[PDB]
Design a protein around this nucleic acid. Structure first.
Ligand code: ZN
Lengths: 416, 163, 198, 52
RNA sequence: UGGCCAUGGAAGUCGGAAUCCGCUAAGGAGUGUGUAACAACUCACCUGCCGAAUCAACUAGCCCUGAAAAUGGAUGGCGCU
């Protein structure tokens, strides 16, 4: 199910947030990650040697803690018999926290999504940078590799390199050694070749489409010999699939040996997709401002109000955003209020005396707003869109408009 | 309220409907709210206070603004009061399967329902109103284990008691 | 359907004729359902209003029924858009109640004018809008700070005059509704005797 | 811009028409069947799309 | 009568389970237009005029649409209603 996947993603996001905060002493923590194809025996051996090396670390507190961390991860790996699909992630350590509570901790988990990253690290903190990068990059891309020998279809997350399907073909020879038949054989050769293109296109429709709408956000044709060209510029290739064709890549090799080549050449064009979608989005937002319309809104004080009411269609946010949702509470009367505060207005603020009654109105701790948007944008209108500061329109949105706004479902008036 | 910003009396009414709880999607104030001195969050809290502990399965909200103090009331709709007098109360979040059980009798309880109707209907007294409110029920299905339709024709009660 | 209903409609009109010895023939004219509902609410206790057809051409069958004359006089007057009002109270009082109720109903573009309609000197209730619609025929209107104010009490339409389209629309925008009426009384039936609103 | 009654007069002649689904023939708005022998008096008709 | 499900908005109207009573002369818990949603408009029952047939769904004859080829062209030709 899709909802169950979303819950698992959120659980793991929460888990990562708790691990980032952790911290401990020296280099006690053991950030370990395993890729899916890898053998467990090989990792178990590695850890055993690392345990051996640690067995002469001059320090006391560091050494013992590290040995016990490596001991624990080795035991965790004994519980598995193979590295599960999606890879494995193991985070062992001896965390310090409040109440002087030097507690040991071990979190192995099969992560959501296939990850391609190996990692071993020891440090004072847990290294959850690779995971956060996989959570950000959800843009799957598709990869068709054409060749006279045989095709290949595959997919490509930020890290992960998939193979969906492939075939080979027994195509005819270039030449026909009869004068009259040369013409006919040539026409027959061109028909067989077109039927191959037709077959490839049909297989692409089967694979890359999901519920009459393409799952992949990009689509790379690679190969040689103006064959990938035939696929892009052809009426047989379906337009809904064809419209997202981003590169035609000239490679050497064919099949899996060329798949990686095609990725490397295509890497620059693939990274630019997110940037283009941002430009289109913010460009559409700024259209409304250029004309009268009045659909657009901006700033927490306005955009949230718009969101509460006659809702937004699209809510556009900067990635980073400072602004934070605090929960203010009264000592005596039990009155409360929530406010969305900037970095200066949140850090120190004499505003929060109750005034009417005459008491100190204590600010009970925050949940950060952009996270707040992510929590319950389903509650409001929907389509939470994060955008960077890189594009010229994006930089305007961040610097000028404060990195927050929304495109509204209908016209709205405002006051004050 | 006409030229700039003036309250001569302000007993201004406007009809909102639906209000089980606060509602995140809200849509309570704007347009009519802020211009006229009624705020937003406080107005939502007052609406929750009036429409709290029954009804929590949809309500009606006439909002009589006295300058800044709104007077929320629950004017009765027939289907709402039937749903209030059901097998209560599994409020929200399961729930889910669904709100259409509809085997909750109400024989002499609907007599109160026809009485509380704000005159209306262009009736010849309850004899005809009984027929109306006995069919408003999409869910209830009338007495113990009855149908609605033609059992209504043979009524033998409450003709002279409902005025 | 429409055999049993037709028989039921015959039973309704005969029962009303048997119950009440007095009927008030009222012309429906350009009338709303809302008007008819308001009339029902006002005349609920005493009178019962009805709206028929050429099965009101059937008082003949009531007169046939081993009893009544006098209903023979009522046959020619069931023409035009006609409805009945059966009742037992009185005649001149009920006529006054029918006259007193009525409804506004805004200008009919093309039809005759019953009274001398005027346009009092007052603001429209708008911003800087089209004064050209008012001044096209022959009205003195100024933009006296935003609002379109009419600057003189003038008669547009007189008695027995045809109402133009543009002037009818301007009256509808101003919320001036002298035209229409509600319902008219043509003839009466009172225990055998016929009157003509007198 | 343009007087409303005058406009609707012009509309009657250019806008309030049926259109044949087979041959695109422009037909009077009462139409049930087409005019045209080329489409065999189709009867697949649609209204001419109004300018928004 | 903001009917219920559906809140993302459907108080007749993206959809779907429903789907009856009152007033009734009579109007579907609604054909559509259109609306964020209404509104506003539009689509029975009955009259007023006029003055005998009217109308629906099938079906099969001839005719037509469907029906595009390369020298100029063939119901055998001329022609034929
Ligand atoms: Zn045609």
């Amino acid at each position: 199910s899709a909802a169950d996947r979303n819950v698992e993603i959120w659980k793991i996001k929460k888990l990562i947030k708790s691990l980032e905060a952790a911290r401990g002493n020296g280099t006690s923590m053991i950030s370990l990650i395993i890729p899916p194809k890898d053998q467990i025996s090989r990792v178990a051996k590695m850890l055993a040697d690392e345990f051996g090396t640690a067995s002469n670390i001059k320090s006391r507190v560091n050494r013992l803690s590290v040995l016990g961390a490596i001991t624990s991860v080795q035991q965790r790996l004994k519980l598995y018999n193979k590295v599960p699909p999606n890879g494995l992630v193991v985070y062992c350590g001896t965390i310090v926290t409040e109440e002087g509570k030097e507690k040991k901790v071990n979190i192995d988990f099969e992560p959501f999504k296939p990850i391609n990253t190996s990692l071993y690290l020891c440090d004072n903190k847990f290294h959850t940078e690779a995971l956060t990068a996989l959570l950000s990059d959800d843009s799957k891309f598709g990869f068709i590799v054409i060749d006279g020998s045989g095709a290949l279809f595959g997919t490509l997350q930020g890290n992960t390199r998939e193979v969906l399907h492939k075939f080979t073909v027994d195509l005819p020879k270039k030449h026909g050694r009869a004068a009259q038949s040369a013409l006919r054989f040539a026409r027959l050769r061109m028909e067989k070749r077109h039927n191959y293109v037709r077959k490839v296109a049909e297989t692409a429709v089967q694979l890359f489409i999901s519920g009459d709408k393409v799952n992949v956000a990009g689509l790379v044709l690679a190969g040689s010999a103006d064959f990938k060209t035939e696929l892009s510029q052809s009426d047989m290739f379906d337009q809904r699939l064809q419209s997202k064709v981003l590169k035609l890549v000239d490679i050497s090799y064919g099949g899996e040996n060329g798949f990686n080549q095609a990725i490397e050449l295509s890497t620059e064009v693939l990274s630019n997709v997110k940037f283009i979608q941002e430009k289109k989005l913010i460009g559409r937002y700024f259209d409304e401002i250029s004309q009268d319309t009045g659909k657009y809104c901006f700033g927490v004080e306005d955009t949230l109000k718009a969101l509460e009411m006659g809702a937004v269609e699209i809510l556009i946010v900067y990635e980073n955003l400072d602004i934070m949702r605090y929960v203010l509470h009264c000592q005596g009367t039990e009155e409360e209020k929530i406010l969305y505060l900037t970095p200066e207005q949140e850090k120190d603020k004499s505003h929060f005396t109750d005034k009417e009654t005459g008491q100190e109105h204590e600010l009970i701790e925050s949940m950060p707003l952009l996270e707040w948007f992510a929590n319950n944008y389903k509650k409001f209108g929907a389509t939470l869109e994060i955008v960077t500061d890189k594009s010229q329109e994006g930089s305007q949105f961040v610097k000028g408009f404060g990195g927050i706004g929304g495109i509204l479902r209908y016209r709205v008036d405002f006051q004050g | 309220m006409p030229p700039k910003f003036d309250p001569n009396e302000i007993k201004v009414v406007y009809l909102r409907c639906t209000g089980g709880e606060v509602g995140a999607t809200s849509a309570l104030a704007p347009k009519i709210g802020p211009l006229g001195l009624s705020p937003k969050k406080v107005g939502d809290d007052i609406a929750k206070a009036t429409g709290d502990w029954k009804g929590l399965r949809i309500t009606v909200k006439l909002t009589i603004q006295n300058r800044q103090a709104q007077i929320e009331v629950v004017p009765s709709a027939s289907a709402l009061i039937i749903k209030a007098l059901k097998e209560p109360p599994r409020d929200r979040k399961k729930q889910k399967n669904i709100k259409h059980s509809g085997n909750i009798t109400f024989d002499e309880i609907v007599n109160i329902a026809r009485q509380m109707r704000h005159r209306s209907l262009a009736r010849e007294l309850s004899g005809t109103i009984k027929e109306i409110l006995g069919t408003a029920q999409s869910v209830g299905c009338n007495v113990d284990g009855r149908h609605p339709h033609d059992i209504i024709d043979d009524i033998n009660s409450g003709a002279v008691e409902c005025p | 359907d429409r055999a049993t209903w037709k028989s039921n409609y015959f039973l309704k009109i005969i029962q009303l004729l048997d119950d009440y010895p007095k009927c008030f023939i009222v012309g429906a004219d350009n009338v709303g359902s809302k008007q008819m509902q308001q009339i029902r609410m006002s005349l609920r206790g005493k009178a019962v209003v009805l709206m028929g057809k050429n099965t009101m051409m059937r008082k003949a069958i009531r007169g046939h029924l081993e009893n009544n004359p006098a209903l023979e006089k009522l046959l020619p007057h069931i023409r035009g858009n006609v409805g009945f009002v059966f009742t037992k109270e009185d005649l001149t009082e009920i006529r006054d109640m029918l006259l007193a109720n009525k409804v506004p109903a805004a200008a009919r573009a093309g039809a005759i004018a019953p009274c001398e309609v005027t346009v009092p000197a007052q603001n429209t209730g708008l911003g800087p809008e089209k004064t050209s619609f008012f001044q096209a025929l022959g009205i003195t209107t100024k933009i006296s700070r935003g609002t379109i104010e009419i600057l003189s009490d003038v008669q547009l339409i007189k008695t027995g005059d045809k109402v133009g389209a543009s002037e009818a629309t301007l009256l509808n925008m101003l919320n001036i509704s002298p035209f229409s009426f509600g319902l008219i009384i043509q003839q009466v039936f009172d225990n055998g005797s016929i009157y003509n609103p007198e | 811009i343009i007087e409303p009654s005058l406009r609707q007069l012009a509309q009657k002649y250019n806008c309030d028409k049926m259109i044949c689904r087979k041959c695109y023939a422009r037909l009077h708005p009462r139409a049930v069947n087409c005019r045209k022998k080329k489409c065999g008096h189709t009867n697949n008709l649609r209204p001419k799309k109004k300018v928004k």
